[PDB]
Amino acid sequence: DRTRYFSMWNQAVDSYDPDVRIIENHGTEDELPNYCFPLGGIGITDTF
Amino acid sequence: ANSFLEEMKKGHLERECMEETCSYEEAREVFEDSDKTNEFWNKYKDGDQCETSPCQNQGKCKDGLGEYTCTCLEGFEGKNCE
Ligand SMILES: [Ca+2]
Numbered sequence: 001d002r003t004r005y006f007s008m009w010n011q012a013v014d015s016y017d018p019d020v021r022i023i024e025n026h027g028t029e030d031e032l033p034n035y036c037f038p039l040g041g042i043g044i045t046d047t048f
Numbered sequence: 049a050n051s052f053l054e055e056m057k058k059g060h061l062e063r064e065c066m067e068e069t070c071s072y073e074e075a076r077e078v079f080e081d082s083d084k085t086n087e088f089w090n091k092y093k094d095g096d097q098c099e100t101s102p103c104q105n106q107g108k109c110k111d112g113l114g115e116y117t118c119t120c121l122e123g124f125e126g127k128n129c130e
């Protein structure tokens with residue numbers, strides 16, 4: 001086998017992820033969106 | 049008057065200095081002009097003071113935070129050109 005690397009003499013083969021060479025663009029999961037909010041949780045109250 | 053966005057959006061006189069205290073600058077921001085900054089902000093709570101033209105005999109008016117200046121011409125003077 002070749003996959004395991006050996007540190008006796010720097011034995012390790014050149015590797016590359018396959019997705020880089022060929023992509024499989026499924027898309028994404030763009031369902032229920034996300035949001036950011038004020039640090040106190042209330043935007044602006046109005047004295048009443 | 050003041051908020052995270054009340055003083056972050058566009059400066060408009062039809063927004064900040066009108067319905068609260070209008071302490072300062074928000075009457076100067078809209079115009080970028082320190083000339084009528086304190087000759088108009090005195091007229092936010094109690095109403096105007098020179099609209100009556102207390103100075104007669106063709107005398108101009110000047111508004112101060114409590115008292116009124118009446119400029120009367122050569123040989124004319126007075127607290128209200130009086
Ligand atoms: Ca406002």
Ligand SMILES: [Ca+2]
Binds near residue numbers: 075076078
């Ligand atoms: Ca302003």
Ligand SMILES: [Ca+2]
Binds near residue numbers: 073
């Ligand atoms: Ca303002």
